[PDB]
Every structure is written in C-alpha cells, then in structure tokens.
Amino acid sequence: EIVMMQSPGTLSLSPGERATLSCRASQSVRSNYLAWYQQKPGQAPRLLIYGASSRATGIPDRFSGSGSGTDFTLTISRLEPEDFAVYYCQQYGSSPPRFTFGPGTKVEIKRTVAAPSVFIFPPSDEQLKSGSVVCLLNNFYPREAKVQWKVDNALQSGNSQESVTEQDSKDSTYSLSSTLTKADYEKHKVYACEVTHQGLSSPVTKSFRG
Amino acid sequence: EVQLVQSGAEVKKPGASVKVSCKASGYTFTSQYMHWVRQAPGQGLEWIGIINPSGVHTSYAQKFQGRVTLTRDTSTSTLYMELSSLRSEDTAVYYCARGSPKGAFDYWGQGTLVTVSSASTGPSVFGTAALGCLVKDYFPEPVTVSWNSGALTSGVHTFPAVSSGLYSLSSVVTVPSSSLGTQTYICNVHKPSNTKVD
C-alpha cells in the first residue's frame, strides 16, 4: 500500500498567522490525487482540498494546497479561531482502487490570556441518598490550571476527577469541571476548591453544608 | 440541500455482526460511487471499501476482505455496511462518504458509533449565573445532552465523559441572574440503554 506521513504532529499558532502542514507519501501520487480533510471535534471530516491544489466548494481562498510526486503542503493563511481541527491528507487512485489517509496534524489556536470564572456546586440531596462536589472553571486560556480541593483547610489528594472541553471554535477558551468524588462527607463542613491560573493575579477559592 | 443520513449507534457483543445504513437520496448520490470509512476513538481515518452506482461492483480494503459486505438498495437510495465477527478493535465511528466523480470524499454522513463490548449496557442525573446537570454511572458511550430541547445553544458546555468502570460527564450552561425566575429550562440526557431522562 501507499503509506502517508504528516508533520508536525501538533501545531499551535495565533489568529492571523500562517499555518504550514506537510504530507509525505511513500510512493508518487498518480495524477496528483492528493486530498486534505478538516475534522473538527465531534464532526465528520470535511473536504478542503482535492487534486493536491483544488479548493472544494465553499472553501475560503486562505486554504491552499501544493506539491507533486511524494511531497505535498497545505497552507492556512489568516488563521481564525474556527480553524481549530485535525487535518488529514489522503491519496486516492482508481486502478486499482486505493484510499489511504495520513495520521493527521492537530492545529491549536493560541490567544491572549483570559481568566476563568470559578463556580462551586455542592452535591444535591439526590446524590446523598446513594451514599461528589463539582468545581467549574468557565471560559479560560491557557488550558493549564491548578485546581486544589481543601476540605476545612486540608489539601485533598487522590479523590478528584477533572474534565476539560475542547478549545472553543469562536474565542478559543477552555472549560474545566472537577469532581471531588456520604460517610466521609458528614464529618466536615466547609468544602472549597482553589483555582490557580495565570489569568488570575491572585489565587481564587470558592467555598460553601446548608 | 442533499445530505447523507446514517443510522443510530448500536452496541454488539463480540463475535456478533452489525449492519449500518446510510440514506443517500438524490442524483448527486445515486449516480456516484459510495465509500465507508471508520475511525477508532482517538485514531485516524481508515478506508473500508467502495460500492458502485448499480451496487453490483465492490472493492474492499485488504484489512477488511472477507469480513465486510457492502450492499446498495437503488429503489430506496439506501447503502448498507455489514461487518461480521466483531472484536474489540472494530469499535469505531463508521462514516459513509460520497465518492466525488473527481475522486475525493466531498460528502460525509454524520457517522455511526459501533461499540463492541462484553459488559452489559442506564445513567443517573443529579454578574451572571450558571446551572448544570451531573450524569454519572453509564455504559457504554455516548450520552447526549440537550438544554430546553435545543432552544438554548448559546453558552452550553457539555464536558466529555470520564474508577468503577462507568462513564460520567457533566453539561453546564450560563444564564443571567434575571432569567432565573423567568425561564425554566431542563437538560435532556443514552441510546444503548434507550434512556431519555429530562
């Protein structure tokens, strides 16, 4: 078969900058039948470029492909927050029918620092009947954030599960959701989560039984 | 607008067979070759095979030879993908794509997730303001989350799922303080367990 390679593995750039994606094929691609596909989170792939350099219908001029033989390039000028996706290259041939994809290149969009909005959610009485405090960090950049739980000024370790959304397709902000997963809960009172982030000039803590 | 519409997600035991469908009405589809591409979670795209307009000719990838069967119904404009002897590595989102007369796949279906798990398939739910719905203990993926029947789509954050072996995700939303007492919204939660809690 025709093995497809791509580089780099991950690319992180700012809006308005130019992204350069490479695609290498193990054999020469007959008729320059090279395609580039954009796949955003939770969506199906979307055809950007076919025939090495042909924009599909609806694709803006800032998307551009080039190359021949074994080396091909996709250039995304004037990057936009909506361009956050994984980009695959694909060769296709007719005689015999052959369709192989590249491993993909994750393109991340950088932005300016943005501070999170912390929200404390104590567990409702519904979950207490079965025998998990949820801390929310809403719309922030960058992704790296230190979330620490302190039950009555006691740093918890090994009892919290975090979850981060994908980078937003409009403002490139992340959202995090911690879960401080009834026996050990009725012994303490003041539960809190402290968030540390470079958008906060000082550490912020959200506390709250009753 | 012409559009590919695939069937819902199915959960199949190992060794069982699965049959996924793809509705491809309109001359744009009925006059072209159709393809099937799958994508294992966190992996790239893998081409499965191709079927001709009349449905008589097929060509399968070397990996899937002998295990897949592509069929096409021209009187209903419906495509089918059958894969037998499902193993764990077959768990993937199976896409149906239209082969452009020029070659590339320019039309794609939304995808169909096939979960090959031996474990049994029922989730439980529990300036400005913010509200959320905690959905824990569920298997297998996924568990869709909507707010006010999709009427509120500006500000929603449905986190991905995450010890006991059961999935758990949360869906949050942001609303002003004045809209709390005026608008009453409910979150709409799992096709494998055929559960639809609000």
Binding site: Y92, S94, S95, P96, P97 | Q32, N52, S59, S100, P101
Partner: peptide, 14 residues
C-alpha cells in the same frame, strides 16, 4: 476521463 469513469473501466475486467 473522470475518476468515476476510470473506476468504471476498472470493474469492466474485475
């Protein structure tokens, strides 16, 4: 010829 036509010529012998 178009890619679809090249495929049609492929399945003529296969």
């Amino acid at each position: 010829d178009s890619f679809k036509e090249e495929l049609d010529k492929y399945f003529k012998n296969h």
